């Protein structure tokens, strides 16, 4: 019942190979809906989900112009950052940022976000109050002082509490048949002998959306956290996700083990066992 919109910016310098490349992707929950790449032949914001295609040409022109302006802004930011850390012009560096809003079942703002990272390390972040900044080091304090002087936080606040929430609610309605549809996991347990002495039990969850899920193994009703191998949730390529959890069990003790599945799409949490 709760939802998020997020935009993700990445800028990567490449001395001797042109100017820094800029990429943006936009998500609603776990669904990518828009992209931009400055290395594209004719850079434009492009749709990646059917429900955003209905936006008109004025939408796409504004979104494209924002991304083209951001391409230049992030290139200046990267030049400033190089100086803040006394770095050579010879190295490649990365600047990332994410911003957006979370909304509850009633469509009201839960919280907003805007944070940045330099070379994979947190750099500066807007606090949950949408009024103050947390700077990671003395370089980020330079940015902070400059954004405090320009009252940047007030602009973000106005955006995150207004436009961000209102456009998220628009997208959720326009794409309600998918964005507000939870697809439950299809679940089964497989058995893989290792030796005469033990075998793997693997609990599968396939075809689910959104990606959030809980998969756990219990032995005699106690959780086997330290003994469970859990793979990262992975995209199937058809909007849905996959995950599995595995435990190594002594031969003949299989019925002491239970797999447990929680997902938004399930009428009730599942309890599964090996069924030879």
């Amino acid at each position: 019942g709760s939802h998020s919109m997020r935009y993700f910016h990445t800028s990567v310098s490449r001395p001797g190979r042109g100017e820094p490349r800029f990429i943006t992707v936009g998500y609603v929950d776990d669904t990518l809906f828009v992209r931009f790449d400055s290395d594209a032949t004719s850079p434009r914001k492009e749709p990646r989900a059917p429900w955003i295609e209905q936006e008109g040409p004025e939408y796409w022109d504004r979104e494209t112009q924002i991304s083209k302006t951001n391409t230049q802004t992030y290139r200046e930011s990267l030049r400033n950052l190089r100086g803040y850390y006394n770095q050579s012009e010879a190295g490649s560096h990365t600047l990332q940022s994410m911003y957006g809003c979370d909304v509850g079942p009633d469509g009201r703002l839960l919280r907003g976000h805007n944070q940045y990272a330099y070379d994979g390390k947190d750099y500066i972040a807007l606090n949950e109050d949408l009024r103050s900044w947390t700077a990671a080091d003395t370089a980020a304090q330079i940015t902070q002082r400059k954004w405090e002087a320009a009252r940047v936080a007030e602009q973000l606040r106005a955006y995150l509490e207004g436009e961000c929430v209102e456009w998220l609610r628009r997208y959720l309605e326009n794409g309600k048949e998918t964005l507000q549809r939870a697809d439950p996991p299809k679940t089964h347990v497989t058995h893989h002998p290792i030796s005469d002495h033990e075998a793997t039990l693997r609990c599968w969850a396939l075809g689910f959306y959104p990606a959030e899920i809980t998969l756990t193994w219990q032995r005699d009703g106690e959780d086997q956290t330290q003994d469970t191998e859990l793979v990262e949730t992975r995209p199937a390529g058809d909007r849905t996700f996959q995950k599995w959890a595995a435990v190594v069990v002594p031969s003949g003790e299989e019925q002491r083990y239970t797999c447990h599945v929680q997902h938004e799409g399930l009428p009730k949490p599942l309890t599964l066992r090996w069924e030879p």
Partner: peptide, 9 residues
């Protein structure tokens, strides 16, 4: 839709 005033760091 995106925020239109991303600032320089």
């Amino acid at each position: 839709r995106e925020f239109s005033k991303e600032p320089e760091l």
